[PDB]
From a paper:
Heat shock protein 90 (HSP90) is an ATPase-dependent chaperone and the molecular chaperone functions as a dimer. The conserved HSP90 structure consists of three domains: an N-terminal (N) domain that contains the co-chaperone binding motif and an ATP and drug binding site that binds the natural compounds geldanamycin and radicicol; a middle (M) domain that is responsible for binding to co-chaperone and client proteins; and a C-terminal (C) domain that contains a dimerization motif, a second drug-binding site, and a conserved MEEVD pentapeptide at the C-terminus, which is recognized by the co-chaperone HSP70/HSP90 organizing protein (Hop). The structure reveals a hexameric assembly with triangular bipyramid geometry, in which the building block is a dimer.
For the C2221 and P21 crystals, obtained under similar conditions, the protein solution was pre-incubated with cis-dichloro(ethylenediamine)platinum(II) (cis-DEP) and cisplatin, respectively, before crystallization setup. All crystal structures were determined by molecular replacement (MR) method, but only the C2221 and P21 crystals were refined to 3.0 Å and 3.05 Å resolutions, respectively, with three and six molecules of MC-HSP90 per asymmetric unit. The refined models of MC-HSP90 in the two different space groups of C2221 and P21 contain nine independent polypeptide chains in total. The P21 crystal has three open-form MC-HSP90 dimers in an asymmetric unit, which assemble into a triangular bipyramid architecture being arranged in a right-handed fashion around a pseudo 3-fold axis. Based on the observed 3D structure of MC-HSP90 determined in the P21 crystal, the sedimentation coefficient values of MC-HSP90 at dimer and each oligomer states were calculated by using the computer program HYDROPRO, and compared with the experimental values from the sedimentation velocity experiments. The atomic models of monomer, dimer, tetramer and hexamer yielded sedimentation coefficients of 3.7S, 5.7S, 8.8S and 11.9S, respectively.
Residue numbers in the entry:
A (entry chain D): 297 to 349, 360 to 394, 407 to 552, 556 to 613, 631 to 698
B (entry chain F): 297 to 349, 358 to 395, 408 to 552, 557 to 614, 630 to 698
C (entry chain E): 297 to 348, 358 to 394, 408 to 611, 631 to 697
D (entry chain A): 297 to 349, 360 to 393, 407 to 611, 631 to 698
E (entry chain B): 297 to 349, 358 to 394, 408 to 611, 631 to 698
């Protein structure tokens, strides 16, 4: 019966919401609507203030059911409220309208720039889960997403904003996943993008890994991970092509040294200060997902790499060159969020180096 | 507490009800009583305003809660009742059920005395009274009095079986009913023509449960209910009839032979006026209506009808005629549709129809 | 053990099968394979002789894990019984191999026409259910369909077979759906096509309705229901001009019948699929056919009833007999075409009147 | 967040308790504390007014679990409330909740009037806890309250039982049985009562169960008065009186043991009888009369037993002496709360005794 | 297969039985039948050798498996039956009716083998009795299967049919007593006079019996009557209701005196027609709770010395203290004897001690 009129007050909605759910605080938002034509039903739906750790079904004002899956998808299982149908699985249509209507509410929630943070803080996970599952609403959900970026400082921003700041000739949305904003932001992988004023999205939640599988483009701009092989930057490929064949020798030398530990050793287009890093194949598991393969990129303009090619052009079968190459690889792994096959040998390799720094 | 005093206000009862059942509206009716001697217990029972859909009466023993659901505390047909039972003894709850049932029936009867507002109760719970007629053998008579039906004499009102009996003719020994899908379906059905013509009142049972309910409702005030869609309909001048039976006796045998194993007998009707014939079913088999919710059929013929009068003249004078064969089967087939059965093979029925049109046209 | 060997007698497979399923007879078919590389597993799968969510047992390193793994085999292949034994703790890759191999097995069965009857009798339902659900396989599946037709008599044929026998002026595959082969082979709908030796596929399973939705064409030819409005058939010029003289000859009668029939029917058109029947009811291009778990009256220009009706109607368009007779044609045509009557009792009273007319 | 303030009116506490439990009346008691340091958490706990025929857990105001089988020990499962925490290691929360409940119960006890309300409903649990909770056994036993032979209609504590003990009284005497009237008037408590030695009347079933772990109270052992060898304060050489009587009836005892064959294990001169001629006590371990083995103590100062001594010695084989001994035995069984292995025989025996008392 | 031939050997049925149910031993009996007309189905039903502790008949349609646990197919009391039903078409209330018909047919055929019926009856008598309670329709056919020890029967269990054959000319009732054991019921106060006169009493000595005789009201039109309820009717109308009518009014005084002393503890005190050697007993009301089940009349023996001399003592002053103590004692021991419990044993004891003091000096 409250489900039945309109211009109910906020306090009235609150009370119904509270008695319905045993919540001690009132609803964060409400969406209250009816449908006409084929099916006729009214829905009253609440967004709770806190994320959980169902909706009641009526036919003509008589209670039918509590737990009814099929009514609303799992990624929207936080929604509480009532659905009162007029009739007697075609309620698949009810599901389609409820999902239309929540999404509308979320969009409405998103227009209040200042207070969306409340909803988003709590339910970003569910939006993300939905991107994965709800193929038909992947676009409209993608517009609800918000991320920290290398341009965004302390604010989380929309992919729409990201696109506004895109360069003339930027075809790709760049992102990185990891544990913390600071870990990814100081990561080797973003050094060069970040130097040239390219914006990288910092995806720092575990779902994020799961979600980017499915989020393949936004506004016709494809997302690419700055931790996978073959980074496309937006002329000066001649500058690049020269460095590639300059270090082709050293690449072939390091690859043979590392044998089965990497698939390739290439010349980087993504490093500034770090000498090298470990990127992964486009289709394999990432370093961030391996918790629960590998190319090694070298920085042509780094001085450790620069003197390594000298040392390795003149004599490849050296004991020091081998040991120096492995060490780079090993530390690069650690740095790219991988774990060592055997840390004790890595340790001993470091003590050898330490001794060479110290006399005898 | 609330289950414990008296001269509680309606508002108090309502708030209690609402909390007990998470209903948004208060109760339609309330019965709050107590029992001495044998067992000691108090009961507060509510009738909701709207029917639901494992009973729902909370059992307490000395103000402490024991059970939410307790089969045996009240029969299934009364399961819409919501309320509390508080016993003082309890470790023989047949004693509780009997008093619970006694008191509801009483409440219902008081409801029935308020003519205007009985409709509210009845609209919602007549299903349950009818179910009880089927189940509760001991209270079958009392439940029968709470029943209400549309009749051929009642127009737009539902009337009681008591009112029905008040208007029975002098020599009428039977209450007549028909079961069907809607009010208009049964009222214009073949089976009430003659009864209706002679001002005999027919109860129109138009809900599915009615079929289940009349299995057990055999009489009311010592008058037996008889369905008007069954064989051997007895009416309240029998020699007028007996002439007509022996006159059309011949035709019946020729028709039955043409119809072979589709009908058991072909008989002369006592129930038709404007219709040439109908399909009545044996006293013991499933009704026609009880198949719309998914034998044996008799075909009754109308002695007074023109079609039958001149199909007799056609069948004395030669019984092997092809068109007489065709005419008999087509009466039988349409008689089936009419009586709410289904055609075994529709395609052949249509070709049968088209053949008879080719004839009513000259071709 | 049994899932490891491979020169294993049919008796040994049958024995395993019965103990696995508590069936009393052996299997109809067996498929026993292994898979290398990506994932390492063995499957041994059985087709039961009688048609009975899924019941494939999952083993890891000869240790029993699960009995009901919903992800292992698609819903439409749930009659498959047997075991998957793996070498390591995704399932999409297993599923992929299970459906590949079943389908392979099914095609091997299809080779032996004698034995494929036994299979298809029991599981054709599932092959159709699959055309509906599993689209990556729809094409392989549709080659396994077999239907009775108007030229197959007592054996079921495939669509490939149906296409070879087509006239090459014929663009469409014809089908009718209904309850029983006898019901459909005799319907007004197939009269003219059957006289022309044009082949109609008889589709006498409830699922066929479900399935023809998805099976929109075969080998570039579109399937057309013979129950639906506007049926196109080989239109020789000698003929399709004959169809226009009749068309206009009964132009007035069609209008007069539409008028009498008011809201019960959408158009009264002159027919092109009737030989001996005076008329039939066709449904609209989309929107429920007669098969229920939109309306056109087509009249037959060469049927004496229709020929006479034209004369009586064009003599006096408001004859109460003409009206009555038209509604009787309509009603009986509803009955033919698989519909129920909105008021049986009125149809009866109409029939009594027609009887009275052909008698005095 | 009612579980947060602490200027809370009882009205507000009650309103919360009712919404939490759907009870009609408010709480009997409320304990509402917080914990600082190790783990941080707040608890709001209620003692309902009527025993049932549990605890909601929130973490940082988020509902996690309604039923958590570790939060509170099983005997305290009547406590209704919420625990809200900062994060099995619920061990530590448990500990605290049981500490604070006992703290509260102790406080309820100090308010003599109202504790009776509490102890009526929950004594059962308190005893159930005596059985299970060894760490809190002593503290729980201080809550216990019993009818005694010196308490009237009032129930009294064990601490109060002890203040009235003679200091030569070593033991705390108890009797378990069905009703107060029944135990108070039993033959077992006759002489203790006469001496003014206090007997605890335990009349609940659980009491049998509880005394199995409640062995002492303030270093004073609990003896059942229903068991063999009762020890009571033996004034100087009153025990030398009890040794004359002992040898006086040494012979009678031997005879009755013979007569009683295997029904009874010993016949002894009682030290617990004033007016009853005899009684059946059970052995130190082995089922008491509360069966949900046997000695027969005779009263050396009862006229029946004194006469029996004379008849029995004059002639140990008299059938009247036999019949009289069996009858004494049987009626003593009935008194002591056992059943007769053959009532119809005992009946017949009585009929002979009646024919004797009358002369036929 | 197995459920479609016939002249299948026993070893075959046995093998099928074992595999179907995981029993180590083969079936005690088997019933394999088929049905036409309404529905068509075949049924293969086994009686196990041992009683177990939902039913389990496997339901097949056209030889494919459908359902293990299928209630409604066979009534609860017949849930020991294991086996298979293969229906040709699928109002399975019909199937149930035939299943039950054919089980009873099998039981009757078992009962025809006097010596070996014991094997079945030992295990399943409970289930038969449960049926008598539940299956109103088959109550008669089921009653024909029951067997009981009777006062006539010594060490054998007899049918009610045989009971009826031995009835005296003028005996209108079948007499029963229910109790814990044969020796207890057989030597009870309540059967003395019936037994003296050659009237057969059925000894019902299992708890289900109490439950069973509620519904088992007659047999061969002869009504069953408990010997522990008020108003026992004997056939003795040998013009000797006058004999009985004498004693009735002869002890009318003593009866009313005893009733006043016994106050609310008995409904009435009457002169008995069922005692020989006992002085009195406690019968219960025709409608209340029996004794054997955890309103009382006190019947008194008009021919017993104790009761003969108490009538003297009662007329010679009713108000006497010892008369009061003696009446309560008879009542009390009568209670224990008739299988009730004493409300307060300590006072019964103290009463006994007083009387013992009389017997002795004191």
């Amino acid at each position: 019966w409250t489900r039945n009129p309109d211009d109910i007050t906020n306090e009235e909605y609150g009370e119904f919401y509270k008695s319905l759910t045993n919540d001690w605080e009132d609803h964060l938002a409400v969406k209250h609507f009816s449908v006409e034509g084929q099916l006729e039903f009214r829905a009253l739906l609440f967004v709770p203030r806190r994320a959980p750790f169902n909706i009641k079904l009526y036919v003509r004002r008589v209670f039918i059911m509590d737990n009814c899956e099929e009514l609303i998808p799992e990624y929207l299982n936080f929604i509480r409220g009532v659905v009162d149908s007029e009739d007697l699985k075609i309620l698949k249509v009810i599901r389609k309208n409820l999902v239309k209507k929540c999404l509308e509410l979320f969009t409405e929630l998103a227009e209040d720039k200042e207070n969306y943070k409340k909803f988003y803080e709590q339910f970003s996970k569910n939006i993300k889960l939905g991107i994965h599952e709800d193929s038909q609403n992947r676009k409209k959900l993608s517009e609800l997403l918000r991320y920290y970026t290398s341009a965004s400082g302390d604010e989380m921003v929309s992919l729409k904003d990201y696109c506004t700041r895109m360069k003339e000739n930027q075809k790709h949305i760049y992102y990185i996943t990891g544990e913390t904003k600071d870990q990814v932001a100081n990561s080797a992988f973003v050094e060069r993008l970040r130097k040239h004023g390219l914006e990288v999205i910092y995806m720092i939640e575990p779902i994020d890994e799961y979600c980017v599988q499915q989020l393949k483009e936004f506004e016709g701009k494809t997302l690419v991970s700055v931790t996978k092989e073959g980074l496309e930057l937006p002329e000066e490929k001649k500058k690049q092509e020269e460095k590639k064949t300059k270090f082709e020798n050293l690449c072939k030398i390091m690859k043979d040294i590392l044998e089965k530990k990497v698939e390739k050793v290439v010349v980087s287009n993504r490093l500034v200060t770090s000498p090298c890093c470990i990127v992964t194949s486009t289709y394999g598991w990432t370093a961030n997902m391996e918790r629960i393969k590998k190319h090694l990129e070298i920085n042509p303009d780094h001085s450790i790499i620069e003197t390594l090619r000298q040392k390795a052009e003149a004599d490849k079968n050296d004991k020091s060159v081998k040991d120096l190459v492995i060490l780079l690889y090993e530390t690069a792994l650690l740095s790219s969020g991988f774990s060592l096959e055997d840390p004790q040998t890595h340790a001993n390799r470091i003590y050898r180096m330490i001794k060479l720094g110290l006399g005898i």
